[PDB]
């Protein structure tokens, strides 16, 4: 450790922030409420407790928790002692969750009591975990008891900024969940990079030191988009809602005067459709919408409620944020219909992001508002590869750029607009489902000859899976029978819960290509 | 060059900014005006011209220029081809300037025609420079002609982010000017670090994308505090005033609607005292004051003009910015007298800066509002050492922290307040003078027995040098004779021009210590 | 490549064998029959075909095939060009097979047509495979057509002997299948090491140059125990039976005059129980029994048929062979009952194997015939770790020895006798099932409170799983309902086919320990 050789460490985000008010509050719904000074104490207590549990630098601590203060402490204390924080996506099927736990080789799992039923399905096949800390919202929490037995004093190590700080698994690709990891330097740069982008907005879409922060993106989803790191960096009041309940979320916005939040379009649809939201005041509330395309109708409805609603774009692989919608003063003077179109765009690339539209030959395409191609990016917060993966990692970084798998056109003013997907994947309410995997399960039916699963757009869910099934030579099976057939795979924890919204459309034939492959591009036009 | 191994390069500040409007203007006073798209073209043309002149990676290009568009292009094009940009402090004496040119081994000097008289004094003793490009504000500029002969196309190299990008020399220490250098990574982090700090301010002291930028800090002074990099990153309109004339500066603020600027307290004193400023409107003008302590009276006078005036602190060695004044909403509601006290503080440390108060034994002192000690800092943009210097570099980084040489107390809320200096140096209107060097010159007088030079505070200049001279056994020399004696050293280019404000006070004795050393701490109390 | 620096390469097993008769035959059941000279030609043709398909050194070629001549060519040609041969255990569930294909990142899969139904279950989730070569026992084989288009000339590379030659996955541990790998040097040493052991036997249990070899161990099971490499090294006639049919196997033994074979005890039980075997002559037939404990009754029945039947011991992790039964001339003169006891022992350690009995503290135990402990081994053909695995690899090599997970006592004469298992795993007919995984599936039943699965010994299957289920507070579910419940998991390809032999025994309570854990050691005594 050379003192002049500064390392970009997550501990510098905490102890060298943009602003620190020791009396500013971290609020956990209606369960807990303490100050930033207490939060710094609990990070050091957690670091002491982790050291006592034998967590060393390079160890993996897994977290299965809701959006809480404990998760925020996990964001700092675990990477800050040099350990790897593994955010377990609790919305995956138990079999997928078991894979990521064994693949990541977690030493300790901090699991909420409500996720214990998931554990009992896969506990026997977990071999790396030596300790389970059960998390509770009451005084009987094992995490809270571990912290109480520790001092609020800890000297956090200096290590290389390229130490891996966080890992998590995305199901956005084919096959098994892929592990993406991020270093301390990448997370620090992502915090400063996006703060420099959305902090410096003139009027609209600002994250500033006077904001009150409440995530409605799960903290296992690409670091809650990285906003808890930015919210801590700004020293703002942070409200953690726990398990997402629309009435609980709406009460927290009014009671804690939340001004900045973020979520997938499904959450905003649920928040705006709730009967209690009708009498609510949203004048000071800003929400950035990511994970899925923001519908113009949903953006318009939020605008009528005086919500500063704008869109953002990112990936698990890309330290999430790649582009955010920024409106010029001229664009802010437009009518609600014209404003809703700009606010629902994919967005302009954020600072230090090189986003290009290319074709299959990696040739860069002109940035007119019509020519479409895959988005390839270079940024200081991209995963260099998938964890313990070679061939898929090479495809991710083919041609020297990270491939997003998203087809988009970029206009003259830099506004990206995603048109469709390269990958044969469907995102439902923020969770991934693989069409090929869904086809395989539905093909296991005895009276099924061919299955083609496509993503049908949905106003509430974003996309829903549509299975176009060709019957056998003399087979007659109703559509709802296949839905019940696939439900049994969900009940066993093999298929994702989001396939419960699958629609089966029996068709006489499935359109193909001259080579014999299924033509899904032409298939979506017909249905 | 590994594509996934992102390098923090100054070319990423330009081509991956927070915002880019190709039709946004770069304005050079009343001489030139072009768009950001032209500015990017002229950077590539300059890169082509530098390549033709044989500038390679690792070469030093020196610039002797006013605050212009050419200097802004020098900020990018020279580091972006991997060359070292040397900002020559044209306010130093010609002998000091000659030292820094030979010490830095400049290959090419871009010198304005008005600085040619400085060159003719030291041209014979310059051995490393092979080409002089003369800069002119008219069409006869050699820099403009070099650019016209080049294409607007250039592929900027990828190199290590630890490549040195900028060098310049500070006279704030004893002895010869010391060379501080900064890498691409340090400059990029300084841009994002301070943008995350002042961009995210809620209301007061904001640098945002809607601002109009005009520096009144010279661009050879620690990168104009780094603001031109931040202004380019935000893609804002930039107004470069050229040579500082109070009427010209005031006209540019009104005509170009400047909203963000920065300067030393002397400049603000001159701007506010100008008769034309009385009828001017300063409602939208924000200026951050650094380099010297901001007097409460000057801050109050600016506040009566509705100027968002706040203070900042930094050094040549520290990538300048270490702390900036940020006001909470409660502090913004105070009266003008109470507000002027907070706005004139040294400030709260910026993001990623670890500022401590220590004693001579490097023991960290409590942060009460009374206990004073030297500020020692750790930050991602500090010079690791002085150029081609070992012993002074070790003292700069003694105890693992960079020593500022400034004595301060930090209060409970984190507000730093500088009390006095460790180093025996005096800063006059933003330029350094060494008391020991001034004593040596005045000691060369035949009728001088002892000389002690101390810095007397000044309302306009900040500090002025005061020489307390003890006469010889039977000598009688008037005070004004010594002032003329020292003026001859200035006319020869050996002593700094700022010593013209020296005051000689003949005293019967000079207070000393038990060890025999001069007691300057007790000496300032008496006079 | 230093010519004097000899590398132990699999190509030296082929082109520098103990004996080479160019007119000696490789027989594939009743489908194909060619000479050793043709076999060497087809290895070079396969090497040419693999080079044309773009297989480079370090690539993985996966094989899903029966015991054939093609598999024998795969044993040589794939490692001999420096590629990794992945032997896919086709008896695993499709989900397990999919895991090993994705974990190993196979580039090309050589799959028999009869295993294509397994592929269609998991084809959509396979991402690394670019080519499937379908294998057929007729002239329409894609492998045969690929070979016909190539020359019989190939210069095989010299590389480091530590190049990994073979990979395969064992399910003998908890969690996911673990990848064990072996280098060229390890495989060469395993061939010479065991040839020096069983070749030098005086009379009984000899593998010599006059033998006729027929494997009845699948070639995906630890290299068919390594015998095809040894059989090729000796240049003996090799008979490959394809898919195991008891009448087909018995016909090949009589028709091809097979003298040396090997199998699990279940196969020998099936061969001896077949009605056609009654009239067969087994005077010259030797078979070594591994994978499971050889019952004394089965050994005695084989001895009455004049079969030279002896036992051997090994693992997937241990290059299989660790110990083989060798009988002294005095032991060969004993009666059939006393001989059957010695022939059914675990065996004496083979050359270059250091086998020790230790306790949980890695303390070596005395080699009396009663004291039992875990077998830990050091040998020149052990896997150094599991593929892409750290924590499980450390447990495998805890204390500097490879842990077998087998409890045994070693007598004074060196005869090992395995008593029970450390790992909570059950082996059924040569395939592994995890008790904890079986408990988890049976625990998913709504009317199940506690499940404890233990391995009950079986005369035919070796071990069968026994589930002792404690009913809920007021639940009444029949035992056969749970068997049908678990069968559905098998039909979906999640649970192993070998769980079809599970027995459910409803019990009022499950014996536990003072710590609360299930006491399976005491549980097996009760049931
Ligand atoms: C200031 C925050 C602003 C940033 C928010 C977005 C971050 C979301 C992090 C996140 O979806 N990871 S993922 O691996 O679960 O999904 C990644 C995929 O989702 C899609 N997609 C994400 N955003 C989208 C958007 N605005 N419009 C349309 N499509 C969007 C897209 O196909 C991505 O490739
Ligand atoms: C957003 C910009 C806000 C940052 C402006 C300050 C940067 C000035 C960069 C710069 O003075 N370098 S130097 O080497 O020529 O001088 C360095 C010395 O000057 C003194 N000193 C600088 N600031 C001061 C301040 N606010 N109050 C009091 N004393 C101040 C101090 O003794 C430093 O050690
Ligand atoms: C000349 C050949 C002579 C060598 C034949 C044995 C090689 C078998 C290669 C093979 O079982 N791998 S495994 O990973 O599928 O199983 C490994 C486990 O099986 C058990 N076990 C293997 N043999 C056994 C035996 N003779 N008596 C009793 N128990 C035996 C034992 O618990 C092992 O740990
Ligand atoms: Mg993703
Ligand atoms: Mg300085
Ligand atoms: Mg094994």
Coordinates of N, CA, C and O and ligand atoms in Angstrom, one line a residue, chain C residues 168 170-173 180 314-318 386 404 406 423 427 432, ligand 6:
Chain C
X168 N -14.3 -35.7 -16.8 CA -15.6 -36.3 -16.7 C -16.1 -35.9 -15.3 O -15.3 -35.4 -14.5
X170 N -18.3 -36.6 -11.7 CA -18.8 -37.6 -10.8 C -19.9 -37.0 -10.0 O -19.8 -35.8 -9.6
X171 N -20.9 -37.8 -9.7 CA -22.0 -37.3 -8.9 C -21.9 -37.9 -7.5 O -22.8 -37.9 -6.7
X172 N -20.7 -38.5 -7.1 CA -20.5 -39.1 -5.9 C -20.4 -38.2 -4.7 O -20.2 -38.6 -3.6
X173 N -20.4 -36.9 -4.9 CA -20.4 -35.9 -3.9 C -21.8 -35.2 -3.8 O -22.7 -35.4 -4.6
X180 N -13.7 -33.9 -12.5 CA -12.3 -34.4 -12.3 C -11.7 -34.5 -13.7 O -12.3 -34.8 -14.7
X314 N -11.5 -48.3 -6.6 CA -11.1 -47.0 -7.1 C -12.2 -46.0 -7.1 O -13.3 -46.2 -6.6
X315 N -11.9 -44.8 -7.7 CA -12.8 -43.7 -7.7 C -12.7 -42.9 -9.0 O -11.7 -43.1 -9.7
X316 N -13.7 -42.1 -9.3 CA -13.6 -41.1 -10.4 C -12.4 -40.2 -10.2 O -11.7 -39.9 -11.1
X317 N -12.2 -39.8 -8.9 CA -11.1 -38.8 -8.6 C -9.7 -39.4 -8.6 O -8.8 -38.6 -8.6
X318 N -9.6 -40.7 -8.6 CA -8.3 -41.3 -8.3 C -7.7 -42.1 -9.4 O -6.9 -43.0 -9.2
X386 N -11.2 -30.3 -8.1 CA -12.3 -30.3 -8.9 C -12.3 -29.2 -9.9 O -11.8 -28.1 -9.6
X404 N -11.0 -40.3 0.2 CA -11.8 -41.1 -0.6 C -13.3 -41.1 -0.2 O -14.2 -41.4 -0.9
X406 N -14.3 -43.2 2.0 CA -14.6 -44.6 2.3 C -14.0 -44.9 3.6 O -12.8 -44.6 3.9
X423 N -19.2 -40.1 3.2 CA -20.2 -39.2 2.5 C -21.6 -39.9 2.6 O -21.7 -41.1 2.7
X427 N -24.8 -45.6 -3.7 CA -24.5 -46.1 -5.1 C -25.4 -47.2 -5.4 O -25.5 -48.2 -4.7
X432 N -24.6 -42.9 -8.7 CA -24.7 -42.3 -7.4 C -26.1 -41.6 -7.2 O -26.7 -41.1 -8.2
Ligands
LIG6 MG1 -16.0 -40.8 -7.1

